[PDB]
Every structure is written in structure tokens, then in C-alpha cells.
Amino acid sequence: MSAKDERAREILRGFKLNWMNLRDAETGKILWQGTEDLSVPGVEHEARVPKKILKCKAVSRELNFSSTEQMEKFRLEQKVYFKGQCLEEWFFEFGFVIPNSTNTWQSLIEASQMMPASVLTGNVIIETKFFDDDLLVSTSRVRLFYV
Numbered sequence: 001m002s003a004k005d006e007r008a009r010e011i012l013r014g015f016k017l018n019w020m021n022l023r024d025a026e027t028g029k030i031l032w033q034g035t036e037d038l039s040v041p042g043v044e045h046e047a048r049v050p051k052k053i054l055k056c057k058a059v060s061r062e063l064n065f066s067s068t069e070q071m072e073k074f075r076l077e078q079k080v081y082f083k084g085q086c087l088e089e090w091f092f093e094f095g096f097v098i099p100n101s102t103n104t105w106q107s108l109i110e111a112s113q114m115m116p117a118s119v120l121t122g123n124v125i126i127e128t129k130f131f132d133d134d135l136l137v138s139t140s141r142v143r144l145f146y147v
């Protein structure tokens with residue numbers, strides 16, 4: 001293959017998403033805790049989160065990942081699909097990743113066009129594109145329910 005395909009596969013085979021917390025950015029209280037690897041591609045993951053998260057002005061997303069491979073510029077492109085059409089796009093950059101390292105990464109998700117939980121629940125899918133700089137490594141998807 002292009003050998004970039006092989007590098008991308010190398011990075012993916014050595015990557016794990018170990019845990020993720022979603023916090024109310026006002027209090028730090030944990031609204032949702034996940035220990036399963038919801039970055040695995042080729043599946044449609046599901047996350048059931050408390051509907052009150054929709055009333056937080058901001059959510060602090062704190063995750064922990066491991067990577068056997070070095071990355072020059074680990075970053076995410078995330079698309080929020082509502083009823084199959086892109087509603088919002090998020091961009092987050094981690095930067096350099098030491099080979100065989102385990103790293104905690106905090107990002108703030110900030111807010112309007114806010115719809116009720118009954119409308120959003122089961123109709124929101126987050127597509128996450130995992131890049132090292134300009135190299136697309138993987139794409140994973142999670143469907144959100146607001147309970």
C-alpha cells in the first residue's frame with residue numbers, strides 16, 4: 001500500500017482509549033464515566049448520558065489514551081451529525097505523543113440552537129476522525145442517548 005496506509009495501521013494497532021470522564025465544567029461533577037474503548041472503528045458505540053448535560057454551558061471532557069507509536073501532531077476532527085446531517089464541527093489538538101506513552105487529555109466542549117433531549121436523544125452521532133498531522137489514522141462513531 002501507500003505505506004502511509006501502513007503507518008496509519010501501525011498507529012491504530014498500538015492505540016487505546018483507556019477511560020473518559022464527562023464533567024460539569026461549573027462543579028467538576030462527573031456526569032458520565034466510560035472505561036470501554038469507544039474509539040474502536042467498525043462499530044457504532046452507544047453512550048447514555050444524563051439529560052441534564054444539555055443544560056451545562058460547558059462540559060469538560062477528560063480522557064486517557066496510550067500509544068505505542070510516536071505521533072508528531074495527534075489531533076481530532078469531530079462532527080456532530082443530527083438526523084444524518086452535520087450540525088457542528090469540533091477541532092482538538094493534543095500535539096506530540098511520546099512513543100509507548102500514556103497520556104491524559106482535557107478538552108472543553110462549549111455551547112442557542114439547543115434542542116430538547118426528546119428531540120436529540122438517539123439522533124446525535126459523533127464521528128471522530130483521528131489524525132497524526134495530515135495522516136488520517138481512523139474514524140469511529142458514537143450514538144448519544146440523553147436519559
Ligand SMILES: CCCCCCCN(CC1CCNCC1)S(=O)(=O)CCCCn1nc(C)c2c(C)n(-c3ccc(C)cc3)nc2c1=O
Nearest residue numbers: 038039047053054056057058059088109110111128130142
Ligand atoms: C449542537 C449540539 C447538539 C448535540 C449536543 C452537543 C454535545 N454535548 C455538548 C454539550 C456542550 C455544552 N452545552 C451542552 C451540550 S454533550 O452531549 O455534552 C457531548 C459529551 C461528550 C461527547 N463525546 N462522547 C464520547 C463518547 C466521545 C468519544 C468516545 N470520543 C473520542 C475521543 C477520541 C477518540 C480517538 C475517539 C473518540 N469523543 C467523545 C465525545 O466528545
